Amino acid sequence: GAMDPDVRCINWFESHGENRFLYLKSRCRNGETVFIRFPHYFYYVVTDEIYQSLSPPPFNARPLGKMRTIDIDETISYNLDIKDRKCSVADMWLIEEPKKRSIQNATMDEFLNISWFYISNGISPDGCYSLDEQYLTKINNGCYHCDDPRNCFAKKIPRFDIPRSYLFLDIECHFDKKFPSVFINPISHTSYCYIDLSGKRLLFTLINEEMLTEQEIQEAVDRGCLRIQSLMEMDYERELVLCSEIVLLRIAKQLLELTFDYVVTFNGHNFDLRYITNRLELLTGEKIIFRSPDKKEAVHLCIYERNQSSANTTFHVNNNNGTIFFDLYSFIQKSEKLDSYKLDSISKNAFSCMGKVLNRGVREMTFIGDDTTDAKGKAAAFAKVLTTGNYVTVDEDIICKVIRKDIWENGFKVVLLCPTLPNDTYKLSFGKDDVDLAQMYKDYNLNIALDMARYCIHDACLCQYLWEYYGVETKTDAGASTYVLPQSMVFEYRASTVIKGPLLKLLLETKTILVRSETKQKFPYEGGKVFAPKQKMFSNNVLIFDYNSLYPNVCIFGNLSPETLVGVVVSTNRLEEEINNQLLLQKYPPPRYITVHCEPRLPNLISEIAIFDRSIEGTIPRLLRTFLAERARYKKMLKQATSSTEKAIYDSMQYTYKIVANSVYGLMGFRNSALYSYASAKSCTSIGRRMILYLESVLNGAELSNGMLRFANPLSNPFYMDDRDINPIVKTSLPIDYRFRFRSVYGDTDSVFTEIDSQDVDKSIEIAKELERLINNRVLFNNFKIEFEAVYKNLIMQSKKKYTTMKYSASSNSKSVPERINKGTSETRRDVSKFHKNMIKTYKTRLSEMLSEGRMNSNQVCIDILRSLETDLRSEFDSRSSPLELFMLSRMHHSNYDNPNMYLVTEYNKNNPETIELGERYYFAYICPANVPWTKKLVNIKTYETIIDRSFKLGSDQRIFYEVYFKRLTSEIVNLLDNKVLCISFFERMFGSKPTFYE
Ligand SMILES: [Mn+2]
Ligand SMILES: [Mn+2]
Ligand SMILES: [Mn+2]
Ligand SMILES: [Mn+2]
């Protein structure tokens, strides 16, 4: 009977007919769901003078107050004759119109209608409300209409928790050589993971009958599977069902038309759903049909795309029913920087745990994980994935099937089909079930269909595991709140669009409108500035300091905004440059104005100087100031809340404010954007770069002796003269006996790395904490602060992208387990051989000791270690004492997509008693005839790849083709060195080739 008036908004969505509306989907405290319909309007902002003129009057209008409208067009000046920026004030009107309308000079045109709805009616997209039933009339069951949302939604109330419904799905399609085409290839499996409002999980997979033998189908039935002849006969409590492809497809249609809250896939929008839909249209006549919650609009499922050059394309479903069809692949690309976006990689990273060993031998290891073994509930997370996972990865390398599993709420005991090297502990990774599908389909029988079924249900459940892991639900709500957007639009729309809501709110609060009355000239701030460490290998510890949100703070410091730009003053020669500078300093003095040297915009200009008035806070800095404040709030709320549901909400809010803040720098240089300002963007780049150089200049050559830190330069504010004590000799609270010396070793857009002549990590942390304090209190100024993140022992670094170190964090002490940090790399188990590993490990240990002598050029180390390499290499090529075991490499056999490796294994099988079967792990080496001398040409090495089995003995008339292994080894060694010209000389002489340098 009676509707519950207490609702929590969870999505908003539009119909698009000639007769169009806005719809809300909300959830009551009980679990009932209320859809509410609102009439659509198109909003326009006009001046009072325009309002009064309007041909027929607008449907409705609310005044906005007086508002300053400002010309933000950017102009360069060749002298200091800079005209004031055009500014007018007028009473403004927000007008509502049911049909689109062209208004000759309407302002605020960039902002979205949906944003105006929320702002105007005073409605938060994710809020909870006690609806005033007085303003709702019913129209279907469950669906009401609201002509007056302002009054209906007048009583906002605190957040209550709600349950939600999910369908996670994945499908498998047949193929042999080409990528599956809908016209010829059938769907073989469809797997579903349904989460009910109760929390109950339902797993079911439909297998396509038509790809099995009548005898096999009956075997499946005999074994436990349900066979069905139509949609009508489907029992959803059966985990395995056999049916025709047409039935399977009809079942998909029925599920996809249901009003789940979320339908979640990994690349389902471009593949899985597209395929189901087209295949259905082919085999029967049928479409998949979504309907608005009042049944007024129906649409056929049609996947559409959205484009965004900086770059990628994303795919979206057009359902008008309130369901959020959400693709994890698209999302994980937008919101994470990763080397792989394959699902096995993303899962490997997300789901790992530490495994203590209980049994050994046979071909079966056994592990346990729990709170004792890794962290609190890291094993709980792993154990949830194990419910459906069938292959675990041991120690980054060993893929190996599960044989049995015991799962409880906090830990897992798992037994695995692998080799044996049993230490007390090992790392366990998850992800897919790895297979060769192409072969599975070629040989397809019942036991393979069931295998694929288990593989497929897991890829679906990975979507629910990753959805929990990335906190998508709460991020969606936080997004919707902060961006002033429907939940469904939060990760669909691009960054230039999501910033517009909070910008609009700011412009309204500051009674300001920004108008670009001109075509923007073309140029962004592209430059491609990438940063090279002073040396690669570090004997000493390295201290890591991060600026705090540098670019947000730079904009705040300089008050960088299109409308606070007084002007830009350019010069083509030094006379103009000097005259202009001396006039600049007279007419626009600090501290009210800041003047910023930028890279000049034209090639004939020798200087470009942007001048900003700091007296009246600019739009952009204030936007950022809000975002940092809001983030700060939520970080506190995060620590004061204790319910893990609440922790998640506040953690998301906090994240959302980080992201939107960091979007701003980019948006200032993106031409199609509401925050575009070439000068501001360039000035921001430039001020930040200067802050890096200032910090570096002060620390590079700095020493701590007695109680005093002797900064290497005076602590002068780099932009203008300052109240602060520039004295670089500074009292510290460290021990008098301490004597240390600092070197600026690397620095980038926001981070600075400082070598200290010391290996004692406990002291290094003591000192770095003091450095932090003095940098923040004496070196820096205004809103510029650094954190001391960590100490880096045994840094070996090529760039910020490729580096390896042990990391003692700021919490850390001398004797807690570091964090091994590897980045960018490609090797381990048979990618590289034991000869190589042993040689790299020695040449590192010899080289780190060489840097602790202090006696070196770049060259005296470089000459010394390359003499050593020749001597060891020529020695092994002569003596040949090293076993073949040291030169063996491994590889998995599999079918094509690789091509010469099938020829390698085929011919081995075709010529030898043993067979290397199609998922076996086989060994090989680079072997050549003994009568080949030191070779500096090269061929396709693939000819000297030689399968080494148990009965292989090295010919009396063969040798290990040492050159292959040597060339690879000295490549890795010269990339540790610093003298480049000496290394290239060596490598052309020894190998007749020019080396790689990871740049
Ligand atoms: Mn898939
Ligand atoms: Mn799959
Ligand atoms: Mn930090
Ligand atoms: Mn066989």
Residue numbers in the entry: -3 to 306, 314 to 900, 904 to 1005
Task: Reproduce passages from the article.
The enzyme is a member of the DNA polymerase family B15 possessing DNA polymerase and 3′−5′ proofreading exonuclease activities. E9 alone was shown to be distributive under physiological conditions (adding fewer than 10 nucleotides per binding event) unless bound to its heterodimeric cofactor D4/A2012. A20 links both enzymes, and the DNA-binding properties of D4 are believed to increase the association of E9 with the genome template thus rendering the polymerase processive.
However, the modeled DNA fits very precisely into the exonuclease active site of E9, in particular regarding the position of the catalytic Mg2+ ions replaced by Mn2+ in one of the E9 structures.
